Amino acid sequence: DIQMTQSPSSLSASVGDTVTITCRARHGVGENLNWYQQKPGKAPKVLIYMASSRQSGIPSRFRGGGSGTEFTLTISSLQPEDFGTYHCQQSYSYPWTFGQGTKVEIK
């Protein structure tokens, strides 16, 4: 099983700034890393598909990229609606493991 980590484990920022969450793999996965947004008490929804491909309905404020083992999610012009826990998942090889998640508090 490919082990996943994420950094920072706890993040906070004010409305309108730009933040970065980095998801790290023990082994390379090409571009096959998905990003999800989980609201407290709700199931997550996917934000980014193959590392950089954004899901329709998600505003352009959510950007991402990277390859190999180090990937980033960049959230520009942070909004109150962006409060929640972000997760990253590898689709390259089975099991499709997840990182521990990053909690984003909005101030």
């Binding site: 491909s53 954004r54 329709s56 352009s60």
Partner: protein
């Protein structure tokens, strides 16, 4: 009394030309996987420039405008590029066992078809079922329940990738450096002939690549009145493009919800089709306000009467035939609607109930779009209630005998939709070099780009810098961008080479040693410099230009360079 040839660089002279144009878009409009690939276009400038050309009258002809053919080529190439990396439905051409789905309710419009699919991935025949629209399935074996998918026998059906969006995004056309686009600003311009208010732009306004027939949607409206345009106009076999003064709001809908299922075709590939119907079954329809359409026809009839003399005008429905060409059509919401439109062309005007006209509409998935044979697209189900609320801004009419003219909704190819937006634009080629007589021998207020074009040669001659400071500086748009840059480079170097040989590489005004020959133009300098514009002069000198150039290089730079070579001693 002796006049000498002098070379000018930056002459506001243009000639008609056909060139490759490149695209631009509003980078802050901006979804990817859009069929129009607008993310590959150069971002537009917030400042559009727009220089009004005083004293310039230009001849515009919408029916021979290369920009329309170029746009059609780009639109078709973009569709083929977008659809290419998608699932082919070749394995899906199988015998369908179809029964009517029982239920303004529909009466047999949706069929429940069960068929068995042979799949490569495993030797496996699976009995699957799917829902299809009546227009998607062609009956076979007489009265048997056997059907096939429409156009399978004539084309290879390509499934559109569900991630592909069909939303129109305005596309700006921009001339390569060294070329310019002239825009006609006449309020009642009829599409042909002279235009008085002509402005120069680098890029056109945004054009929404809306694909429709009979009625023009979105786009742009006329400013003063309804304008009816044609080519010969006498010839009944010519499309009449009607641009409206005020838009008509048309609200089309597909009230059914449905669900979507995926039937695997092969590894990594599946057929996306309609599943169980959620909710009741209601006919798709479109609501257009009656009073607004009534006034729209009143204005159209007035203009048609003015151009066709005081004859009776009657609007009829289009002749029966293939729904793709005899019905109004559009791709609103990602689904493809075909609407009857008869209620809009069913009245005699010569010289009463219901606030809204409801047009029945039918949904089709297998589309032989662009009037081609051998290709077809399958649009996956959207699974949603499509509220459209689009603007009608123009009509395409055709003409067919007791003193009455009969008009039908219709048109030719999709080009008619784009002329409506490109009618005011012309692409021209700038040739910044020219020659003129002056009194000087070598003896070894600003308006913007081409703003002096309508001025006399004098007064215009002090703005040559304005043009000199201009000119220069893997999909469809990438290649066209590459061709545009290479063309601009080639033209800049041709001009620089000509200036280099003459002996004028560093000057906007360059004096030569070649005397002026009275046979070229037997006119005094005041008759030339204070009467003619640079374009009239260039046309007048167009028969002797190669002679002047031959004399200037031969006698001025291959002899100056030999006389100087001898004088050093």
């Amino acid at each position: 009394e002796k006049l000498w040839v002098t070379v000018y660089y930056g002459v506001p002279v243009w000639k008609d030309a056909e060139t490759t144009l490149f695209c631009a878009s509003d980078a802050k409009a901006t979804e990817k996987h859009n069929v129009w690939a607008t993310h590959a276009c150069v971002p537009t400038d917030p400042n559009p420039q727009e220089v009004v050309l005083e004293n310039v009258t230009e001849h515009f002809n919408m029916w021979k405008n290369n920009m329309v053919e170029q746009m059609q080529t780009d639109i078709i190439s973009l569709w083929d590029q977008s659809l290419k990396p998608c699932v082919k439905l070749t394995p899906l051409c199988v015998t369908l066992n179809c029964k009517d789905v029982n239920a303004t309710m529909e009466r047999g419009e949706i069929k429940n078809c069960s068929f068995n699919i042979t799949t490569e991935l495993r030797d496996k025949v699976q009995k699957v079922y799917a829902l299809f629209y009546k227009l998607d399935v062609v009956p076979i074996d007489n009265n048997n329940t056997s059907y096939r998918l429409i156009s399978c026998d004539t084309s290879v059906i390509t499934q559109a990738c569900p991630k592909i969006s069909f939303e129109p995004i305005p596309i700006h056309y921009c001339a390569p450096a060294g070329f310019a686009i002239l825009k006609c600003n006449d309020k009642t311009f009829n599409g042909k002939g002279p235009c008085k208010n002509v402005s120069t732009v680098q890029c056109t306004h945004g054009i929404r690549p809306v694909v429709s027939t009979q009625l023009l949607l979105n786009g742009s409206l006329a400013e003063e009145e309804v304008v009816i345009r044609s080519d010969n106009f006498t010839n009944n076999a010519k499309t009449i493009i009607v641009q409206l003064k005020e838009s008509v709001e048309i609200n089309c809908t597909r009230p059914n919800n449905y669900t979507r299922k995926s039937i695997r075709i092969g590894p990594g590939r599946a057929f996306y089709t309609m599943g169980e119907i959620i909710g009741d079954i209601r006919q798709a329809h479109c609501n257009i306000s009656r009073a607004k359409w009534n006034d729209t026809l009143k204005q159209i009839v007035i203009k048609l009467r003015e151009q066709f003399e005081n004859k009776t005008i009657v609007f009829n429905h289009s002749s029966g035939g293939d729904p793709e060409i005899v019905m109004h059509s559009f791709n609103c919401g990602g689904e493809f609607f075909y609407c009857n439109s008869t209620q809009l062309f069913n009245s005699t005007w010569n010289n009463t109930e219901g606030n809204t006209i409801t047009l029945p509409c039918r949904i089709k998935q297998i589309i032989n779009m662009w009037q081609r044979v051998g290709q077809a697209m399958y649009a996956p189900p959207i699974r949603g209630q499509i509220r459209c609320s689009s603007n009608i801004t123009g009509l395409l009419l055709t003409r067919d005998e007791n003193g009455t003219e009969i008009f039908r909704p219709g048109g030719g190819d999709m080009r008619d939709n784009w002329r409506s937006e490109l009618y005011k634009y012309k692409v021209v080629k700038i040739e910044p070099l020219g020659v003129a007589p002056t009194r000087c021998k070598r003896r070894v207020v600003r308006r913007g780009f081409l703003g002096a074009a309508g001025s006399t040669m004098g007064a215009a001659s002090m703005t040559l810098t304005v043009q000199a400071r201009n000119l220069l500086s893997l999909g469809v748009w990438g290649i066209k961008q590459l061709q545009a840059r290479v063309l601009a480079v080639e033209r800049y170097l041709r001009d620089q080479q000509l200036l280099g040989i003459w002996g004028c590489s560093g000057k906007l005004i360059c004096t030569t040693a070649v005397p002026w020959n009275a046979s070229w133009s037997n006119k005094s300098l005041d008759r030339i410099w204070n009467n003619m514009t640079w374009m009239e002069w260039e046309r007048e000198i167009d028969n002797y230009t190669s002679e002047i150039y031959t004399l200037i290089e031969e006698s001025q730079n291959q002899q100056e360079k030999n006389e100087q070579e001898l004088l050093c001693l």
